[PDB]
């Protein structure tokens, strides 16, 4: 329809889907999975951008950087540019020096606060343009803008894809080095502990998941089966009783990662899964309280935190009741 954009989003986490793609490919493509908005950058051949959104509306923002650009006409007459016809950039929004969810606003805003172009005070009523040198963007797809004008499938496996972005990047950075323009980081797990190993690694970062994708997957359009989301988005309750620490006999960390948490059913979980920062936030504590013994691990730990109800969050649910990567997400 007109210019309904229809990006690919990544369907929940199903261990077996995933298990079936790794099976039948060999291997897993996993990124991050950014926190930001979804930019999908539609340039025709008349050399017009549109800075739209996972939803074809323009983001506030960026709303200053459609319309026409010369720097567009010579991309596209580039040797290097395939996509003569126009093309749409598939990726994530980020700015630059705030959080994830102030850059979020920061992009949805018209009216200041500034993080403004003008320049490189105000009170109302001033469109926000926000600075080019804020947006730092991460690329994971990239479409003949016909296809994405038809409603299609774009038919380039998942593999194939990251070679369209990694050679639509120079092109971009040439022409247009006001923006950051990258690529998303992208790791290949041969097997199922390789990617838990992977999504906690990045947990431990504070990124909340990473996007599983299927490497013999096309670019298929709205949500669909294929990139899966590996992040605890079943979200439950239970009372924290205990305190799970962190392997000693291989790996990591030396200090608490998680939470023993009774769960309704009668099910203890340990939810893990965990930041870091709070990881070294909860020992802290944890080595606080046992310090009026001073000692810290007729004497043991106090966890000034038993009896905490909570709420975790988990992948998925077993037949047998099993919780599927569980996470702390807050006390409640
Ligand atoms: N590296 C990535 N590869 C693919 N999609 C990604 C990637 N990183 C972030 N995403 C995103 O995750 C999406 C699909 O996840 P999801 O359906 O949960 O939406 P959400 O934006 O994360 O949250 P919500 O829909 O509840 O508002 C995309 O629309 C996209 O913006």
Redesign the pocket.
């Known amino acids: 329809v007109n210019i309904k954009t229809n ?4 369907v ?1 986490f199903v261990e077996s889907a995933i298990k079936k793609a790794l099976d039948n490919a060999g291997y897993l493509i996993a ?8 930019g999908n950058i539609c340039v025709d051949n008349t050399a017009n951008s549109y800075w739209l959104s ?1 939803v074809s509306k323009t983001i506030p923002a960026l709303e200053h950087l459609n319309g026409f650009d010369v720097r567009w006409k010579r991309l596209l007459n580039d040797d290097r540019c395939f996509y003569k016809d126009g093309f749409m950039l ?3 929004l980020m700015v630059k020096g705030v959080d994830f969810n102030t850059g979020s606003g920061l992009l949805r805003t018209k009216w200041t606060d500034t993080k403004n172009q003008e320049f490189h005070r105000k009170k109302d009523k001033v469109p926000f343009k926000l600075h080019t040198g804020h947006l730092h963007i ?1 690329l ?2 990239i479409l003949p803008l016909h296809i994405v004008e038809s409603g299609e499938d774009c038919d380039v496996m998942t593999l194939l894809m990251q070679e369209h972005v990694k050679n639509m990047l120079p092109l971009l950075q040439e022409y247009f080095p006001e923006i950051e323009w990258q690529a ?3 790791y290949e797990v041969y097997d199922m502990v390789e990617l838990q190993q992977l999504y906690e690694q990045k947990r431990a970062e504070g990124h909340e998941g ?2 599983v ?1 299927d490497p013999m997957c096309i670019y298929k359009r709205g ?1 669909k089966s294929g ?1 899966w ?1 590996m ?1 605890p ?1 079943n979200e439950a309750d239970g009372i924290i009783q205990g305190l799970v620490w962190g392997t000693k006999g291989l790996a990591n960390e030396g200090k608490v990662i998680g939470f023993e948490v009774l769960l309704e059913s009668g099910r203890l979980v340990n939810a893990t899964n965990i930041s870091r920062a709070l990881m070294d936030e909860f020992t802290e504590t944890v080595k606080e309280a046992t310090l009026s013994q001073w000692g810290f691990f007729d004497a043991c730990t106090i966890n000034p935190y038993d009896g905490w109800a909570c709420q975790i969050s988990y992948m998925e649910e077993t037949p047998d009741g099993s919780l599927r990567h569980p996470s702390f997400v807050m006390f409640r």
């Open positions: 990006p690919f989003k990544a929940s990124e991050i999975k950014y926190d930001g908005v979804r996972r598939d990726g994530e991460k994971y797809a998303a980081e992208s990473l996007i994708k949500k990139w989301k992040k988005e």
